[PDB]
Each structure stands twice: as structure tokens, then as C-alpha cells.
């Protein structure tokens, strides 16, 4: 069962990353570290948790018996390769990879994946074993298998079976293909969500649509965003299912602000409390704050910040220090006035920015041309 | 189903009236627009903000 | 002076030229051509003719006696069949047809609609059609 | 020019006054190799196709066993078969079974369209069955798939 | 063609429901479709036809 | 890309800081 094997990574990250602040989740992982997992990492948590007692007893006792059940159809192929078909038949490891990749530990299961890569040249089972290997890379947070084999998964087996296998290459989102860069590639792959019904991977399709609507905020401001998230049947259906995330979206699309900040705090309640917090969600919270200030600051040339406080919430001095950080950071182009409480904005006309961009690009091109001229003819 | 249709037609006729009244002006006050439309300052202000956005 | 001689070689253009179809190119400034008189030839090409104008067996002009490639015509010159002009529209309105909306709408989406929406076929996989064949009882 | 490089079916140029061979023009293409019968890596079904299980067993015992067991045929002294005829209503496993058999026998799959576009140059069929078989003799252990059209 | 050149011939019947569903699953591969299509329901939806 | 590509900010104090300001004296007595 390598397709349900992602329970390993799913519940092991549901505890093991928030295990610094998870009490009942330790007890949740207790009946799944022993009862159904791959191998000897069921010990491993004693380096973080207590010494463990009972898992030494049973887990070895089954496993050697499972190794005693690993003769299986290998010897049956030894008495079944007497037929001279291919010097092989679909009885042995090629039909026994479920144990050695489900129960095999990655130090040996990687070799088991290589063993069942020496297999039939059928593209379907090969693509399945590559998706199994990508999930096995996501088991232990290796961050090299999910880099290497994803090129194999997307490009190398791209000769057939397409337009229906492509809903299994959706794992390239949140994986080494899509890191904390929660931007155009990740949101473009997430926006190809033409499905409602579950297909394992991340579980609980509501969590998938919350991830899609979380990456949609950092995706676009409003270039045709109203069609792709607001005006869609299935996304509005699950927004009817999930009320607070719908509040988070509609406090920005309706430009209401204020309560949007409250929704941000609610998003904070699951920004880091999920499994995927080993990279930080600071480049999401700060980006959302800058996005909200950009959509407020547009269509207001001379806005008093006393209006801005009541528009966004509280914190007049908080508004002052936030803009003082963000303007001089480089984004959010305006010029705040400390006296007279005016926040005046300036925007470059589209002849000066284009002039600067032409000058810079032409400078690097003329430098490259002169370097190429110096390479030849001495 | 007249509620959603009437609300939508109300909104489109609102923005059509606001784009109709604003053609002669160049630097009008929002108070004159609010008095001519017989609505409050805040709804007019947020509607023009949504129109620019 | 080369620009003078480039204009000077245009004497061989003259006016009574036969019309042929270019076929394939052999080497530089020398190719084969198929005359419309019936026979096939291996001629020389003037250097004044650009090589951009020849590809999909375009209509060309050949000399009478020397029978060499001289001129390149506009891409349709001899076809012996004309278009539907502008006065040959047979004045039958769409609303004149009654009770064919199950097939009037079908033939409308099978002709003018994939001009714009051609990428929608590729992202779904219908392999968009080229022709449509109508049939039925006579009348 | 030289006599030995002149072959059948190559375009040549003749002079105007007395027909002497001026220059051998390059040929454009061999027509069958231009439209050449595409060799594919055989994407089988992995034999899950139910209902044709009797056809699976029959095609196994009929065509696969000579490829896998030359020793059995040599020991029994049975001449190995060459061809297999398939018939029935259209759509009922015409090309699918051949693809699955070709992939499971570890051989490449060649499909011959060859209906009437080949025979436009009347005798190209007389070379179509030649060069095709040449590639099927030179490429690998493989099978040849050919349709009703020969009877046509 | 019988002596030496060709050999035994294999018939083919009209397809059953299982082969119909297999043919439908094969021909729905290269098509961007929704999940949960329930191709068995489409297989029992029409009574009987060719491939 | 490691874990954060480049740039970012290392203030180590901005973690829903507006919610802390709203908690700071009850949003300054709800100004």
C-alpha cells in the first residue's frame, strides 16, 4: 500500500514538527508509530520524547516473521521461471514492492525502489513507483529526492498517459518544486484545481481549497482574480462549507479592511500551528500587510492617517511605524508627513521608470558586448 | 428571485448615474456629488474608491 | 555601378513570358521549374530575384526561348477559379431558415468559433476538426 | 559523370540539342521512408483487459510461446509459426491486443497504415513490402501489424 | 497461404460489459476529465454497442 | 533557495504585532 503510505509523512509531521507544543497529538501518534509504519524510526522519537518501553517487543517480532513472509512468491518464481517466457513472470518483487517500499526503511527502501525500478518498461507502473518515491522523499524531509525525481516524474515519463496523470503531478506544490516561494508557479498549479473529489495526497479537500485561497492572496491583487477565485462554483461551495476563510477572502475583495486584520490573526492561528511551519510564514504575513496597504493607498492622493487608522483598525502610532518601515524598505511608494498627519503618495509616471529600465538593461548589454569584443581579436 | 436582480440593477444604475454626473467636472467636491445623489458621504466615498480600484 | 547593373539585367524581363511553377532548388542560383506547357526543366535563376519568394510551389515566370527563371509573380496569379466576389452573395438570410437550430448552431460553432478558442481544444484533447460532411434525404 | 553512380530512379538532366546526361540532380525522398511506419515503444495495457481472457490465453499459446520457447519447438521438432490471423467485428481488440502482446513479448510494435496513399505511385507497394520488412529485419526482434487492406 | 506461410486464426466476439469498461477507460486516458466520473455507471448506462 | 531565498527581515518581533497592539491596553482603549 504505497499509495496510502503517505500516512507516515502526514501524521509524522502532524506530530513531529509541532511536538514541541503538542500534548494529545503525542498520544495520537502513539497508535500509529507501532501499529502501522515503515520501520525503525518508530524508535527515533526517544531522542526527543521519553525512552519508550513496549515497541521493542512486538515490532521486531512481526518484522522477522514478515521477513519470514518475504520468501513469498520469490521461491514460487524460482519454481515458476521454469517456464521460459521472459526468464521472469509477474509474481516476484515486481509484484511484491508494496511491502519493501511500505515497510522498508528508506536506507533500504531507496534500494528497494531502485530494485523495482529494474522492472517492466510499462509507463503506468513506472510513473506510480516514481510518485511513490516522491512521497518517500517527503517522508523524512530529505529535500534531495523530491528535487531529483520530480524532473523524472514530470519530464522523463512525459510520452504517454497525459491529461489524466496530471492530477497526480499536483504533488509538485508544497514540495521542493514549490518551497516558501508562495507565488506564481505554486498558485498557478494550485489554481488548476478542476476537481472536488478527494485524491489522497494532503487529505481533506477543504484543506486543499484553504491552501489555494491562501496562495491566491499572494498570487494576484486583482488582475482577473474575481473570475478565478470569487466567480467559481466549487470554490464558492467549499467557501459555503468554511465560513472563516470566506470571511478572510471577502474582507479583502470587498475592500472592507479592519476586520481583515482580525482574519489575519485567525490565519496566524493556523499559519504556524500546522505541519508546514519549519519554513517561516513571515514572507506571507508581511506580504499581506503590504498588499492591504497598497490597495488602501491606491485612489487616495492626500489621505490623513487618522482616517487610515479607523479604516484598518487601531494603532495610529502603529500605522506610523509600519509605514516608516515599509516605505523605506522599498515597497509601498509614498511620502508620509509626520506633522499635519498627512500621508502623501507619489507615483512615477510611465516615462521615467521606463527610462531607468532601458538605461540599466542597455548598460548590462553594452558591457556584455564589450566583453565579447575583448574575447576575440585580443 | 427579484432581490438579487434588483440589487444588481441598483448597483449598475448607481455606477451609471455616478459616471453620468461626473463628466462635466474636473475637480468637484464630494459634498456636491453627495447632495445631488441624496446619499451619505461615506457610501459615496467607498463607491468611488471601489470604482478606481 | 553595381546598382546600375542590377537595374540593367532587367532587360531579360521584357514582356512575353510564359508562366510556370517552381518545384525544388538544386544549388545556388540554379533550380528546376515546371512549365505549364507540359514539360519539366532545369533552369538558371537571376541574382536579382530574392530567395524569400519561393517555397510552396509558387507561380513564377519563365523566358520564352532561353527558358530560364526571370520573374516571381504575386502568390496567386493563375488559378482558373475565382472567389465568391461581392455581388455573388446569394441573399439568403439566417432567419429565413426555420427549424434548423439544432444544426444551425452546430455549423456556426464548427466554422467561426475555433478561430479564437483554439487553445481550448488542446487543454482538453478533442483534436479540432478540419471538415464536416452533411447528408440526408434529397431536399 | 561516372556510370556506376547512376542507379534506377534518380533524377538527371539532359541537354537541349543532343540528349547527353548533364548532371545528376539530388533525389527528394524515398516515398515510403518519408511516410515511414512509425516504430513505437509499445505502451501496453498491462493485460488488465477483462472479457478477452480467452483471447489472452489463445494469443499466448498461439504466438507468444514460439518467441519465448525456441527450445520447446526444437525439442519437439515443430516448425515455428510465422503469422497469426485475427478477425471479428471492428473495435473489439483490433490493435490493442497486438500492442499488449508486443510489449509483453519484449518486442517493438510496428503499425502499417499502407491503405491507398502508398499505391498512388502504383508500384510503391512493390517496394513498400520490401523496405518495411528490411527495417523489421534490421531494427530488433519485433512484430509487424498489417490491416485488412491487403485483402482490399 | 496455408502451407508454411500463415497459421492458426483467432476469432473475436462482440465485447462484454467488462471489455466495454476497459475500452472506455483506455480511450478516456488522453482527455482532461474530472475525477469521480464513475465510468462503470456510463458502462451500464448504455445497453450494448461496438467499440 | 534553502528556506527563504534571500532578503527578508530579521527583526524577530513581528508576529501578529497588530493583534498585540490590539491587546496593548485593549487597543489603546479602542481608539
From Swiss-Prot, chain A:
SUPFAM superfamilies: TPR-like, Winged helix' DNA-binding domain. Pfam families: PCI, RPN7, RPN7_PSMD6_C. GO terms for cellular component: cytosol; extracellular region; ficolin-1-rich granule lumen; nucleoplasm; proteasome accessory complex; proteasome complex; proteasome regulatory particle; secretory granule lumen. GO terms for biological process: proteasome-mediated ubiquitin-dependent protein catabolic process. Gene3D superfamilies: 1.25.40.570. Residues 182-350 form the PCI domain. Keywords: Proteasome. Component of the 26S proteasome, a multiprotein complex involved in the ATP-dependent degradation of ubiquitinated proteins. This complex plays a key role in the maintenance of protein homeostasis by removing misfolded or damaged proteins, which could impair cellular functions, and by removing proteins whose functions are no longer required. Therefore, the proteasome participates in numerous cellular processes, including cell cycle progression, apoptosis, or DNA damage repair. Component of the 19S proteasome regulatory particle complex. The 26S proteasome consists of a 20S core particle (CP) and two 19S regulatory subunits (RP). The regulatory particle is made of a lid composed of 9 subunits including PSMD6, a base containing 6 ATPases and few additional components. Belongs to the proteasome subunit S10 family. PANTHER family: 26S PROTEASOME NON-ATPASE REGULATORY SUBUNIT 6, 26S PROTESOME SUBUNIT 6. The gene is PSMD6.
Curated annotation (Swiss-Prot), chain B:
It comes from the Eukaryota. Induction: By FOXO4; expression in embryonic stem cells (ESCs) is mediated by FOXO4. Phosphorylated by AMPK. Highly expressed in embryonic stem cells (ESCs). Expression decreases as ESCs differentiate. Transmembrane segments: none annotated. It is found in: Nucleus; Cytoplasm, Cytosol. Signal peptide: none annotated. Component of the 26S proteasome, a multiprotein complex involved in the ATP-dependent degradation of ubiquitinated proteins. This complex plays a key role in the maintenance of protein homeostasis by removing misfolded or damaged proteins, which could impair cellular functions, and by removing proteins whose functions are no longer required. Therefore, the proteasome participates in numerous cellular processes, including cell cycle progression, apoptosis, or DNA damage repair. In the complex, PSMD11 is required for proteasome assembly. Component of the 19S proteasome regulatory particle complex. The 26S proteasome consists of a 20S core particle (CP) and two 19S regulatory subunits (RP). The regulatory particle is made of a lid composed of 9 subunits including PSMD11, a base containing 6 ATPases and few additional components. Belongs to the proteasome subunit S9 family. This is 26S proteasome non-ATPase regulatory subunit 11. It comes from Homo sapiens (Human). The chain holds residues 318 to 370 of 422 of the full protein.
From Swiss-Prot, chain C:
It is found in: Cytoplasm; Nucleus. It comes from the Eukaryota. Belongs to the AAA ATPase family. Component of the 19S proteasome regulatory particle complex. The 26S proteasome consists of a 20S core particle (CP) and two 19S regulatory subunits (RP). The regulatory particle is made of a lid composed of 9 subunits, a base containing 6 ATPases including PSMC4 and few additional components. Interacts with NR1I3. Interacts with PAAF1. Interacts with TRIM5. Interacts with ZFAND1. Component of the 26S proteasome, a multiprotein complex involved in the ATP-dependent degradation of ubiquitinated proteins. This complex plays a key role in the maintenance of protein homeostasis by removing misfolded or damaged proteins, which could impair cellular functions, and by removing proteins whose functions are no longer required. Therefore, the proteasome participates in numerous cellular processes, including cell cycle progression, apoptosis, or DNA damage repair. This is 26S proteasome regulatory subunit 6B. The chain holds residues 71 to 209 of 418 of the full protein.
UniProtKB/Swiss-Prot annotation, chain E:
It comes from the Eukaryota. It is found in: Cytoplasm; Nucleus. Belongs to the AAA ATPase family. Component of the 19S proteasome regulatory particle complex. The 26S proteasome consists of a 20S core particle (CP) and two 19S regulatory subunits (RP). The regulatory particle is made of a lid composed of 9 subunits, a base containing 6 ATPases including PSMC5 and few additional components. Component of a complex with USP49 and RUVBL1. Interacts with PRPF19. Interacts with TRIM5. Interacts with NDC80. Interacts with PAAF1. Interacts, in vitro, with the thyroid hormone receptor (in a thyroid hormone T3-dependent manner) and with retinoid X receptor (RXR). Interacts with ERCC6. Component of the 26S proteasome, a multiprotein complex involved in the ATP-dependent degradation of ubiquitinated proteins. This complex plays a key role in the maintenance of protein homeostasis by removing misfolded or damaged proteins, which could impair cellular functions, and by removing proteins whose functions are no longer required. Therefore, the proteasome participates in numerous cellular processes, including cell cycle progression, apoptosis, or DNA damage repair. This is 26S proteasome regulatory subunit 8. It comes from Homo sapiens (Human). The chain holds residues 306 to 356 of 406 of the full protein.
Amino acid at each position: 500500500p504505497k499509495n496510502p503510505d503517505l500516512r507516515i509523512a502526514q501524521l509524522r509531521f502532524l506530530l513531529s514538527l509541532p511536538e514541541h507544543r503538542g500534548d494529545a497529538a503525542v498520544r495520537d501518534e502513539l497508535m500509529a508509530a507501532v501499529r502501522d509504519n515503515n520501520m525503525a524510526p518508530y524508535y527515533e522519537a526517544l531522542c526527543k520524547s521519553l525512552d519508550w518501553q513496549i515497541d521493542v517487543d512486538l515490532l521486531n517480532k512481526m518484522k522477522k516473521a514478515n521477513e519470514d513472509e518475504l520468501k513469498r512468491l520469490d521461491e514460487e518464481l524460482e519454481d515458476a521461471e521454469k517456464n521460459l517466457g521472459e526468464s521472469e513472470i509477474r509474481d516476484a518483487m515486481m509484484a511484491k514492492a508494496e511491502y519493501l517500499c511500505r515497510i522498508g526503511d528508506k536506507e533500504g527502501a531507496l534500494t528497494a525502489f531502485r530494485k523495482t525500478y529494474d522492472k517492466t518498461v510499462a509507463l503506468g507502473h513506472r510513473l506510480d513507483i516514481v510518485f511513490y518515491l516522491l512521497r518517500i522523499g517527503l517522508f523524512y524531509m530529505d529535500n534531495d529526492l523530491i528535487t531529483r525525481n520530480t524532473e523524472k516524474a514530470k519530464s522523463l515519463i512525459e510520452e504517454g498517459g497525459d491529461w489524466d496523470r496530471r492530477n497526480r503531478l499536483k504533488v509538485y506544490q508544497g514540495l521542493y518544486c514549490v518551497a516558501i516561494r508562495d507565488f506564481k508557479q505554486a498558485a498557478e498549479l494550485f489554481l488548476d484545481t478542476v476537481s472536488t473529489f478527494t485524491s489522497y495526497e494532503l487529505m481533506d479537500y477543504k484543506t486543499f481549497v484553504t491552501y489555494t485561497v491562501y496562495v491566491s492572496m499572494i498570487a494576484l491583487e486583482r488582475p482577473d482574480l474575481r473570475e478565478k477565485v470569487i466567480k467559481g462554483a466549487e470554490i464558492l461551495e467549499v467557501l459555503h462549507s468554511l465560513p472563516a476563510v470566506r470571511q478572510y477572502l471577502f474582507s479583502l475583495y470587498e475592500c472592507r479592511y479592519s476586520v481583515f486584520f482580525q482574519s489575519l490573526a485567525v490565519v496566524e492561528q493556523e499559519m504556524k500551528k500546522d505541519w508546514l511551519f519549519a519554513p517561516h510564514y513571515r514572507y506571507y504575513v508581511r506580504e499581506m500587510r503590504i498588499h492591504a496597504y497598497s490597495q488602501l493607498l491606491e485612489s487616495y492622493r492626500s489621505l490623513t492617517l487618522g482616517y487610515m487608522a479607523e479604516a484598518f483598525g487601531v494603532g495610529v502610532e502603529f500605522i506610523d511605524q509600519e509605514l516608516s518601515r515599509f516605505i523605506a524598505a522599498g515597497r509601498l511608494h509614498c511620502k508620509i508627513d509626520k506633522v499635519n498627519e498627512i500621508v502623501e503618495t507619489n507615483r512615477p509616471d510611465s516615462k521615467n521608470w521606463q527610462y531607468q529600465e532601458t538605461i540599466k538593461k542597455g548598460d548590462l548589454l553594452l558591457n556584455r558586448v564589450q566583453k565579447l569584443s575583448r574575447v576575440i581579436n585580443m | 428571485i427579484i432581490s438579487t436582480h434588483l440589487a444588481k440593477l441598483y448597483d449598475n444604475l448607481l455606477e451609471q448615474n455616478l459616471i453620468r454626473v461626473i463628466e462635466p467636472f474636473s475637480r468637484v467636491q464630494i459634498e456636491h456629488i453627495s447632495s445631488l445623489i441624496k446619499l451619505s458621504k461615506a457610501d459615496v466615498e467607498r463607491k468611488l474608491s471601489q470604482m478606481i480600484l | 555601378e553595381f546598382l546600375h547593373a542590377q537595374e540593367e539585367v532587367k532587360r531579360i524581363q521584357s514582356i512575353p513570358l510564359v508562366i510556370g511553377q517552381f518545384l525544388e532548388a538544386v544549388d545556388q542560383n540554379t533550380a528546376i521549374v515546371g512549365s505549364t506547357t507540359g514539360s519539366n526543366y532545369y533552369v538558371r535563376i537571376l541574382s536579382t530575384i530574392d530567395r524569400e519568394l519561393l517555397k510552396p510551389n509558387a507561380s513564377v515566370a519563365l523566358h520564352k526561348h532561353s527558358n530560364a527563371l526571370v520573374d516571381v509573380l504575386p502568390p496567386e496569379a493563375d488559378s482558373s477559379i475565382m472567389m465568391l466576389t461581392s455581388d455573388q452573395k446569394p441573399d439568403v438570410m439566417y432567419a429565413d431558415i426555420g427549424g434548423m437550430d439544432i444544426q444551425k448552431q452546430e455549423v456556426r460553432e464548427a466554422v467561426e468559433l475555433p478561430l479564437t478558442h483554439f487553445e481550448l481544444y488542446k487543454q482538453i484533447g478533442i483534436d479540432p476538426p478540419r471538415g464536416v460532411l452533411m447528408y440526408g434525404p434529397p431536399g | 559523370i561516372d556510370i556506376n553512380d547512376v542507379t534506377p530512379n534518380c533524377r538527371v538532366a539532359l541537354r537541349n540539342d543532343s540528349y547527353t546526361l548533364h548532371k545528376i540532380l539530388p533525389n527528394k525522398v524515398d516515398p515510403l521512408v518519408s511516410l515511414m511506419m512509425v516504430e513505437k515503444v509499445p505502451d501496453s495495457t498491462y493485460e488488465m483487459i477483462g472479457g478477452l481472457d480467452k483471447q489472452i490465453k489463445e494469443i499466448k499459446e498461439v504466438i507468444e510461446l514460439p518467441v519465448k520457447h525456441p527450445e520447446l519447438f526444437e525439442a519437439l521438432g515443430i516448425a515455428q509459426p510465422k503469422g497469426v490471423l485475427l478477425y471479428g467485428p471492428p473495435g473489439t481488440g483490433k490493435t490493442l491486443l497486438a500492442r499488449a502482446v508486443a510489449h509483453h513479448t519484449d518486442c517493438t510494435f510496428i503499425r502499417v497504415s499502407g491503405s491507398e496513399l502508398v499505391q498512388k505511385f502504383i508500384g510503391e507497394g512493390a517496394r513498400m513490402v520490401r523496405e518495411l520488412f528490411v527495417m523489421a529485419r534490421e531494427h530488433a526482434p519485433s512484430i509487424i501489424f498489417m490491416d485488412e487492406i491487403d485483402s482490399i | 497461404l496455408r502451407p508454411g506461410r500463415i497459421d492458426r486464426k483467432i476469432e473475436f466476439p462482440p465485447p462484454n460489459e467488462e471489455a466495454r469498461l476497459d475500452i472506455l477507460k483506455i480511450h478516456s486516458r488522453k482527455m482532461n476529465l474530472t475525477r469521480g466520473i464513475n465510468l462503470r455507471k456510463i458502462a451500464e448506462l448504455m445497453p450494448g454497442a461496438s467499440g | 533557495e534553502d528556506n527563504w531565498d534571500d532578503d527578508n527581515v530579521e527583526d524577530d518581533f513581528s508576529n501578529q504585532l497588530r493583534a498585540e497592539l490590539e491587546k496593548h491596553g485593549y487597543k489603546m482603549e479602542t481608539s
